Design a protein around this ligand. Structure first.
Ligand SMILES: CC(=O)N[C@@H]1[C@@H](O[C@@H]2O[C@H](C(=O)O)[C@@H](O[C@@H]3O[C@H](CO)[C@@H](O)[C@H](O[C@@H]4O[C@H](C(=O)O)[C@@H](O[C@@H]5O[C@H](CO)[C@@H](O)[C@H](O[C@@H]6O[C@H](C(=O)O)[C@@H](O[C@@H]7O[C@H](CO)[C@@H](O)[C@H](O[C@@H]8O[C@H](C(=O)O)[C@@H](O[C@@H]9O[C@H](CO)[C@@H](O)[C@H](O[C@@H]%10OC(C(=O)O)=C[C@H](O)[C@H]%10O)[C@H]9NC(C)=O)[C@H](O)[C@H]8O)[C@H]7NC(C)=O)[C@H](O)[C@H]6O)[C@H]5NC(C)=O)[C@H](O)[C@H]4O)[C@H]3NC(C)=O)[C@H](O)[C@H]2O)[C@H](O)[C@@H](CO)O[C@H]1O
Ligand SMILES: *[C@@H]1O[C@H](CO)[C@@H](O)[C@H](O)[C@H]1NC(C)=O
Ligand SMILES: *[C@@H]1O[C@H](CO)[C@@H](O)[C@H](O)[C@H]1NC(C)=O
Ligand SMILES: *[C@@H]1O[C@H](CO)[C@@H](O)[C@H](O)[C@H]1NC(C)=O
Length: 306
């Protein structure tokens, strides 16, 4: 008689802490998560002891077990996008066993943003407006830490909502060592004066509409792309909306204009000729050091948003 007294699905933000109450009426508690075609066992508990999946140590626990033997409440800390899925609370008592499920959707995505004024040109105030102009708000360290645990690697320092300047690193290297040297993790410069200029990390929570490509035989200049999205009853998508679209699996091997006068394209399948065997939002720059948005007269597709 296992029950989870919560409506499904449950939608929570990236970087927060989750609590799934599970009650039931010597028993063996087993928590699992079903995401795509895979299933992961989070923890197993019996006789007052909790064995936790090695990769989820300190992240998941039973805060009320075994102090209350019939309370299998699960707590998940530092919610990532890969912590989304169908959570199963399973209890066994001898040959008997029942279960309850709850689908959890972790909303949001963190992305690095280099502005049209180019590298390290955003002070704390302009770092905040760049996110607002891209369907997002400046990210918190908790959100950046969660994105790093999802594999985010970016060797560009950027402002954060707590007036710190950080960047996440998985593969330490000359130029990306920071304060942490060869150990992986999110580097930090500490709290910085607001007049200092860096990039920024933005957190896009959600979007109501859909992102789609609009093209033509001879492509579009930036202003022609803006008119084409308008003609179709839409508008140019922002960088934040493209990242959310990519997160939902959008793939298009063609660069296109965005509302911030940038040129990007999403890649969800790693091919050599499309994205260079990399996944994510690829940005086209003028100079090889990833500086300078393309000239507005350059011809690209239009990335629209309903
Ligand atoms: C105050 C005080 O004092 N403070 C303190 C501190 O101190 C500090 O510290 C700091 C630290 O931090 O440490 C420092 O800083 C530093 O400093 C130094 C000195 O000065 C510096 O240096 C640094 O900086 C850095 O550096 C670095 C280096 O350099 O290294 C850098 O790095 C970078 O990073 C980044 C980020 O992560 C990255 O990204 C990079 O990398 C790169 O990248 C690039 C890019 O991205 O771009 C790349 O490239 C690329 O790649 C890709 C991939 O692979 C590719 O893809 C590409 O290519 C392309 O591709 C494409 C595709 O898509 O694929 C193509 O296209 C195509 O094509 C094809 C053929 O044609 C076609 O097919 C297609 O299409 C298709 O088809 C077609 C036909 O066919 O027809 C058509 C249609 O269309 C379709 O269908 C196409 N596609 C399309 C779509 O269209 C193309 O072609 C190609 O091109 C690529 N690109 C290229 C251009 O190539 C690469 O790879 C890579 O590499 C990196 N880099 C490198 C070099 O590596 C960074 O960034 C930076 O940052 C600094 N740092 C920082 C962070 O800042 C300072 O100094 C001091 O003061 C301390 O520390 C502490 C403790 O003690 O404390 C405090 O308080
Ligand atoms: C997190 O989920 C994204 C979704 O595409 C996936 O690409 C990435 O590999 C996942 N990371 C981890 C560490 O599971
Ligand atoms: C910010 O202001 C301080 C104090 O006025 C000044 O010394 C410093 O050069 C400025 N920083 C930058 C990055 O311009
Ligand atoms: C990037 O390369 C271009 C072209 O050589 C150069 O003008 C520029 O100074 C370089 N660095 C930065 C930080 O823009």
């Amino acid at each position: 008689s296992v029950s989870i007294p919560q409506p499904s699905p449950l939608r929570v933000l990236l970087g927060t802490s989750l609590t799934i109450p599970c009650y039931f009426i010597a028993p063996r508690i087993k928590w699992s998560r079903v995401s795509k075609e895979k299933e992961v066992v989070l923890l197993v508990a019996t006789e007052g002891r909790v064995r936790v999946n090695s990769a989820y140590q300190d992240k998941v626990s039973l805060p009320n077990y075994p102090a209350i033997p019939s309370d299998a409440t699960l707590e998940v800390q530092s919610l990532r996008s890969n912590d989304s899925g169908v959570y199963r609370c399973e209890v066994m008592h001898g040959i008997e066993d029942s279960e309850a499920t709850l689908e959890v959707v972790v909303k949001g995505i963190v992305f690095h943003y280099r502005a049209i004024s180019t590298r390290y040109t955003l002070d704390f105030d302009r770092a905040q407006r760049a996110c607002l102009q891209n369907s997002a708000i400046i990210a918190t360290p908790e959100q950046l830490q969660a994105a790093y645990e999802d594999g985010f690697h970016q060797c560009d320092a950027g402002w954060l909502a707590d007036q710190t300047v950080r960047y996440p690193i998985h593969t330490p290297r000359e130029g990306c060592y920071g304060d942490k040297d060869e150990f992986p993790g999110v580097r930090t410069y500490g709290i910085r004066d607001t007049n200092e200029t860096y990039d920024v990390y933005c957190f896009a929570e959600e979007m109501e509409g859909e992102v789609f490509y609009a093209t033509s035989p001879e492509k579009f200049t930036f202003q022609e792309a803006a008119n084409e999205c308008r003609r179709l009853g839409a508008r140019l998508a922002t960088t934040g909306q493209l990242y959310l679209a990519w997160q939902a699996g959008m793939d298009m091997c063609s660069a296109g204009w965005l509302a911030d006068r940038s040129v990007r394209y999403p890649i969800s399948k790693a091919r050599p000729n499309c994205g260079g065997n990399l996944l994510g939002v690829r940005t086209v720059y003028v100079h090889a050091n990833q500086t300078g948005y393309p000239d507005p007269s350059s011809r690209y597709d239009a990335i629209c948003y309903t």
